[PDB]
Subunit: 46 residues, 5 copies
């Protein structure tokens, strides 16, 4: 009653924030996999 539109707005914000977190992690996972491969192929390692 009356603040319901306020609650919905906060829900949309959380949703947007999660979208970001998600693109951030997909970017992170790709960099981490890059690191992995590279150390995996490091001469000095044997």
């Amino acid at each position: 009653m009356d603040l319901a539109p306020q609650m919905l707005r906060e829900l949309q914000e959380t949703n947007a924030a999660l979208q970001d977190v998600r693109e951030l992690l997909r970017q992170q996972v790709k960099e981490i996999t890059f690191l992995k491969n590279t150390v995996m192929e490091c001469d000095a390692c044997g």
Copy 2:
């Protein structure tokens, strides 16, 4: 009257995102664990 339908939609969307986040983190820890093991076996380190 109420915005239940809209709030539920946002909620469903949040959950879908979270499910992808949990899957991304699961994969990330795996890669990190693979990286860890590699380094431990890295000849130049000891």
Copy 3:
């Protein structure tokens, strides 16, 4: 249909998902700390 109960269900699913996220992060921190300590003892390093 009255949507209250469905909303409550999504929230509980959010919580479950977040409890998984916390445990993943928790394990993740432990692996990266281990990796760090490992690199600190990498003889080819400094």
Copy 4:
């Protein structure tokens, strides 16, 4: 019902926390990228 005010307060805290998380992840992606770029120009690797 009479719990709405407090529900909004919890929803707002969630968003504030989420923004912190987003901010920390963005910096994080930055540090991992620097790490990556360092492995690349690391004479003893590839």
Copy 5:
């Protein structure tokens, strides 16, 4: 009369959980940054 008390409970638990995740992420950034420098001063890199 409603499901609010139960809804409030879930919301409160989401927040408690996010608190841990941001705390965990804060600790992780710190480890990573340290790893970053350590690698930055690794003799074997050139």
